[PDB]
Amino acid sequence: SGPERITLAMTGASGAQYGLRLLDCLVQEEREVHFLISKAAQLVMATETDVALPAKPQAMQAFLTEYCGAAAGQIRVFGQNDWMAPPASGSSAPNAMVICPCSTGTLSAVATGACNNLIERAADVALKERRPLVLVPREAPFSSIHLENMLKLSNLGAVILPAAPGFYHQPQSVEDLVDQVVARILNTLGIPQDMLPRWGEQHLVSD
């Protein structure tokens, strides 16, 4: 259940841990992942984590496959101008797409149709083909520029899913908070997850 193939793009907002945890969960659910990452996101990851991600796609693909315990060819990695990759055309096989984290600059690019690199074109294709598109911005405050871009995209059917974890299961660790956002993304995609219980599911009637 849910999509067999997910385009996962990481862009340069803070929150690299969310994208890595989501990649890991997707691999554990036996999904094929087309993995894309922006130059600024590579710097975020080097800044915020101890993951030493190689820069070139083939080396990055090898690295992420070992990091996640993925099967061979389960993770594809495509470079930022590789227009021969599936996500660049709506004639590709259907994927769901998630941008996590989603920088304000990528939010803006997708909202205006800029298509300046493969991540932006891929989201542009997702919208024109009416395939799932989930954006996970991380910023604060949100300015009116951010909010108008999110509103436009939500009105066009994108899911605006900010990295704003809930506290209602009493988190005990940073990892608990990361998992709550990742679980919400998986819920949105329709992919099984067991990190976030189904609210009130045992609640039969009011007190």
Ligand X SMILES: CC(C)=CCN1c2cc(C)c(C)cc2N(C[C@H](O)[C@H](O)[C@H](O)COP(=O)(O)O)c2[nH]c(=O)[nH]c(=O)c21
Residues annotated within the binding site are: 12-14, 38, 103-106, 115, 138, 168, 184
Our finding on whether 1 is near a second copy (CB under 8 A) is: no
In whole angstroms, what is the distance from residue 105 CA to residue 25 CA? 26
Closest CA to 110 of 180, 7, 3, 182: 7
Q: Which does 32 bind (CB under 5 to 8 A by kind): Na ion, ligand X, a second copy, none?
A: none
In whole angstroms, what is the distance from residue 22 CA to residue 35 CA? 11
Nearest approach, Cβ of 40 to ligand X (angstroms)? Answer: 4
Our finding on whether 17 is near a second copy (CB under 8 A) is: yes
Closest CA to 103 of 86, 87, 122, 119: 119
Closest CA to 191 of 31, 35, 68: 31
In whole angstroms, what is the distance from residue 6 CA to residue 95 CA? 5
Site string for Na ion, 101-140 (x = CB under 5 A): ----x----------x------------------------
Closest CA to 133 of 90, 79, 196, 175: 90
β-bridge pairing 96-102 and 5-10: parallel
Our finding on whether 92 is near a second copy (CB under 8 A) is: yes
In this chain, which of 105, 162, 176, 187 binds ligand X, going by CB under 6 A? 105
Our finding on whether 150 is near a second copy (CB under 8 A) is: yes
Site string for a second copy, 54-83 (x = CB under 8 A): ---xx--x-----------x--xxxx-xxx
Our finding on whether 52 is near a second copy (CB under 8 A) is: no
- Report the interface residues with ligand X, using CB under 6 A: 11-14, 38, 40-41, 43-44, 47, 83, 88-89, 103-106, 115-116, 121, 138-139, 166, 168, 199
